[model samples]
Target: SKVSVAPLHLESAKEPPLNTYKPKEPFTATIVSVESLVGPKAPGETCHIVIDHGGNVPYWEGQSYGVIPPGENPKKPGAPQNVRLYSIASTRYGDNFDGRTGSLCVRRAVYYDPETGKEDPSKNGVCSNFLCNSKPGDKIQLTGPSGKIMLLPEEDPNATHIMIATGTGVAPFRGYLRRMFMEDVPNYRFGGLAWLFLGVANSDSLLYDEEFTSYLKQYPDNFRYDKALSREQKNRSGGKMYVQDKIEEYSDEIFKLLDGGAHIYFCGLKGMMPGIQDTLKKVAERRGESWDQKLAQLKKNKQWHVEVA
Candidate 1:
């Protein structure tokens, strides 16, 4: 009379395609839409842009697309600016489940002069600003659907997935969750847990909140979500609640899951690394274990994955 979770038996040998479109000879796609993903209270602007590939470019979850902005490189005279890579934020079938479109999450990058305390329009991120300001029907040069490190273990549907992200870094995880929970793929039905720990400045800064909350509502047993709102929340020590602090709060559960063969992923700013490493190191010490050995073991087992900028 006991109900047990069943394992999915599907083809997991599908290899990820890489470098299908190189920078020198990139493919062109049309922007279908550009929408804001943040609220008024958010610190900066972030956009969710959709592009129509017309079924030419096929990419799996955890992959990224290189965008070639229009304009000559200031340093290289006649040459165009180098391609900028952005993680694909939609499933292979895309947001509309149409398989012909893909999406990217981008934060408009603006710079402020430290001395003058004024916005420096000239120092703005070239590619990011281009994508953020794109209009529907605009043509965009696209290149490689590169990256392998962040791909999910389609071979192991029963494996637990622990995802941690910050700001727009939640792109790949969005693709992962959508594929795992939203799609009705005949070959794949997720049978394990998918835990996410997202960090942002405040509630207004959180990305994909409604979708995640809906997934939690429908699949309570299979999905878990935690948030670290630095400006609005406090950690155990009364300091700002950063992602690492949230992770530290659940360190025991996290370690237990790792021991149980879970795969942990980290995607966000490189600045997050130090705090996370320090937190885990202290936690490992509390258990009389060596952090270096544990990290090495995780890497050897292919259970630890990271992609930061």
Candidate 2:
């Protein structure tokens, strides 16, 4: 028997376009729409905002855009609000199937007083509120089609992608999925598996559920969709169903895919990683493997990608 060692090429080979428009000289775009993504009963307000860039600022699937909110920073009098980056939620061709428009998934950040359960106006996110409340034709300052960390491995259309996300973190993965399954891209046709594990408070809070489910139905062999509705479902331990719990439920297949050159992506709140990491660690330990070593190998092979904030 002969064994051949092959080098792993997991990172995207295409050179990502970065910072086409800088903060000091940002591009101006017009808001196309601000649609509610969740029901009124959902815990927070998340909006799917579309903007017209007129095909000027181009970005890849996993890139982000910085929004310069209108208003002076109270901390720095007379100065404009600092730039807030939001991941692009559409493919390069955008939602309109043209290069002129882009979309973002923004959740209004309203802090509640833990004791009184009252909303704190002062603690509300400035940029997020502005973006979420934006009206059609509203002029917005935009800077940079930034970030390369989340770019997809387009060079290999047969590559397996295991995506994990929470809340609004589903933005970039939306872009990836649309490109892979929705759009008829002449250059790329995804033949590999795209398994998504999305976690949310409830079904009402699930973003792009219809689109994802449609993909799952259309591409049964190539696409897989799993949801973790924390408020409505329970895990094996009889606790709230989290994204990590889903990972644990499918750990055997997940670990097998990972061992076989699958790329795993994690996005959403930074806090989600800890639980996911612990779950993976326990899963690996159960099989007499070291999670740290596996993670190091994944990183070394450029198979691990993360973008959390």
Candidate 3:
């Protein structure tokens, strides 16, 4: 029997663009609408801003888009207060061919302003500041379809895979679900286990509640959901629960899935790797299996994916 070579998708593997400092393609944009995301798992507002791409540009799910603040006068163009990076929430197969609308989930930033003694709404972030204040026609600068958390759309029509995220991190998964399961694209056939493990500060803060609920209901066998309300638990002294808390709850199933080669993906929160790693380690230890060895295999095979934005 012969084995296939596994490809490592590294950021450094990207080919240099024709010009330095210039991306393959970038553009000027305008806000078309601002809609409520029906969330706020924490102390931030989750608002979705829709930007009309105006023209076709290359993009992929799990990739980010950048927004630049208007430069100051010619005498001295002021630096952009801060660059804003956001994940794409809409699918590439949206209604328009030469254009696409990006949905951004924003949490209002209200921190101490250097000039002010208090949290000044006026000292808003460059991206959020511009986005929140912009009307339907206001223009802005944009770039990038960059990032590496993309799930290699399974070549095997019956590949079993799952997505895990807590709260707004669900944004990219939304795009994946839309293109793979919802759209009527030809040659589209992904009918394996597509579980979503979502943990929010509160159940009410779960974004796309009804739709995710409907998917689980509609495809009871092909799809499933495991939800945890981390903050709603009674751990006043011990600690509040979180997405990671569910790791033990589903240990048996997780082990089974890994044993069967299920691709495990994680997004959101940079410091979560240790927690997740420990969970897997604990499960393997309980069963007398070398969990670290297995995880190393996953990493080498590119079966385990991660994105920290």
Candidate 4:
């Protein structure tokens, strides 16, 4: 398929000109629910926390919000406390689309000492710990749903979205998929492919496994899901499986999708990009194409999107 001049949904819509929230003037949202996405056998812990924004804070998919953990700053006693950012895992209507609810996919943060490369119990992510341990009825401060770079294409319903994610990086893509298969968001009807390549260390750590399976069953033609379980799966190189290996394994399909004007999205650990990019380079070189040139063209066309930290 040729690259259509038609814009995507996000590109088509104008920013809400009458917005009311800011980093300094954050809205206080109450916790609605905190449910674990992974199974009990999972090695790491992750939870989907729903918050009641009271229909005050409006946001779009692929945006991020800042969570301010309650309490005085230990390091700077009189200063404002630290605020960590998390991607919003639900659509504009939120998990329930009630207009009053929003959700966040968060993994509890553990600290490790650089010297020993082991967990340091004395240190922890303040915001991550707060959200992980928060209970219903508890109120927390949240800041801007700030961002535009990662917003899903809102205009072109038939624009294929190639999503590559790992760990909680799958957060935004979850919302993006929901907008296509799970619920009908206004002015959107996904008529193109929605492919996900997710990487994790073990089977138990796969988030929303059942939900994705259900989506696959329901939208068999429109959705595709692939997993790279590093610990449980092996690469063609006879080494431990990694996301890059998965990309290389299916580089043909990926290249075909991109050639068909698909939008590529990458989110997860920042380090994952280099390996993934390298794999793309190898794939392109095999086909007598310059991956860097093609990638640059995609960026120029606004077909490439990335959100990682």
Candidate 5:
């Protein structure tokens, strides 16, 4: 798992724009569309929400936005509510690539309570529910096309990307892939490989299934997609499959990718971190390599990016 290297950091990359906008003076955006990313009978409700900002707000791939649902404090009715952050799903060019719009991949927050043995209607999230149930032409408050660490290396045409995601964590990767494969992306032509290992409960829960499959066929030489269905697939030990299992199974290729100057990103539930690291640890132990040290090195070099909530 060792290789010669100068530095994994791309010096040609530009600094991410900071404080472009603020939530205090938010931008008004209208919903252009809200299409479900999962299947009809999927366990959860996840949608691809396109919002038209009228080209007033600008963002880059891998950035996020804050959605403030129209509401007020229950105790203090006149006050506005807080904004919730959601990862931007479409490229900065927006869904139609017009730059007048941006998108988000959101999962409607539904909580199940066993006490009443039913889905808790009152437990629904404010902003999530609003976005999920929003109709076209609905006006919503948006803020901060913020975050830079997770941004793609647009300056490096040959940079390899290893993206691991679960559920809506796939959001930012959608933007990354679109910029790399779908769009013209002036002065950039991806020449390195990109691998995605997505985990969900079932195939129907796969986010961007159609688009990712099309990318596999469209960029066969540059893209690889793998899925881990915890409810439908099994690991070597005859247990439920997970993203960690996929990583463990393909540790060789992953290590190779790392050695080849690839950037690895982890975006999803914080709970998935432990399992992924354990699997990587086991993989490194087998080959007498230090997974912990290598991981720290990658993070230090900014080649490893994470944005989980």
Candidate 6:
């Protein structure tokens, strides 16, 4: 008996010309609406800007929008900014839809000056700073959507989605839920569990309250919202109480969901990925399993994916 390591793509297992994969076509858009996502997440401002694809930008529900910054080939030192990518927060209105405008929810980033860990709006993160300064009528360069994470099951009619995010990381998940619940399909309205475990220092940082709350009310069977508050917890858990901390709280249930072909996507600080991955490994280990093996199974089934930005 022999066991083999398969190509990450399931399609390759059944074909001869396996290695070549063609990329998707790209599209551009213009800024039609720009506004704050909500009130002062910081002293300056925090926002989610909506860009209408002037023509058509095709995308899977869980793909992202990329920003090509304004700079020259022979770049100068401390250039204005570099390309920044954001997950597409809205879906294309129709199947194979073209020649219409679509929107994206983008937040203006505010980072600490680092000299002191306090709000330094002037410091200006590459994309967010550029985003905040743009006018409504401006044309910001956007590359077509990209990424393989949060993939939709081809014909399953439903999927178990477990999303872990913090701050703006919640963007892509919002679009996924919308496609599942808001869209009316024949008899199969959102079929599997859609769990969101997000973390925030306080209530102030959560975006799209109305949408999240409304979805829960409309589809109680499909969607769930949970949170972890690093600043407000009683006893200590994971350090700094990030989204991964909340994940551990439901470790047993999460493992069950993972076993059931649930997809897990994490977006936020890159600093947190290793720790979160480690924590999940521990949980699976406790149950006499391996996290890497589970991830491989997910890949084999096209049910597990990830993207970092």
Writing each residue's lDDT as its tens digit, candidate 4 over 1-309 gives 111211134334478312256556678899999988787766668999999988777677888878778877788987567777888888766776566677998998888788997997569877887898889999978888787878887678888998888899998988888878876544676889999989887988998778788878888999999999988989887877878898898889888888888999999999899988888898899999999999998998889999899
The best-first sequence of candidates by lDDT reads 2, 1, 5, 4, 3, 6
Displacement of residue 274 (Cα, Å) in model 5 is 0.8
lDDT of 2 by residue, 250-275 (tens): 99999999999999999898999999
Q: What is candidate 2's CA lDDT for residue 112?
A: 95
| Model 4 CA deviation exceeding 4 Å by range | 1-13, 16-20, 112-119
Whole-model lDDT, model 3: 0.64
lDDT of 1 by residue, 1-309 (tens): 111211122123367778989988999999999999999999889999999987678788899999999999899999988999999999877776767789999999999898987998899999999999999999999998999989998778878999999888899999999878887776768889999999999999999999899889878999999999999999888878988999898999999999898999999898998889999999999999898999999999999999999
- Of the candidates numbered 1 and 4, which has the greater lDDT value? 1
Q: In candidate 3, what are the lDDT values of residues 191-225, reduced to their tens digit?
A: 77877887677765677778678777666777777
Model 2 ranges with Cα > 4 A deviation: 1-14
What's model 5's TM-score?
0.92
Best by TM-score: 1
Residue 114 CA displacement from its true place in model 3, Å: 15
TM-score of each candidate?
0.95, 0.94, 0.80, 0.90, 0.92, 0.77
**Candidate 2 backbone overlaps, count:** 0
Model 3 CA lDDT for position 272: 66
Error at 70, model 6, angstroms: 3.3
Model 6 residue 197 CA deviation (Å) reads: 1.6
User: Candidate 5, 140: how far from true, in Å?
Assistant: 0.9
Question: Worst ten-residue run, lDDT, model 3?
Answer: 1-10
Task: Arrange candidates by TM-score, descending.
Answer: 1, 2, 5, 4, 3, 6
For model 4 the TM-score comes to 0.90
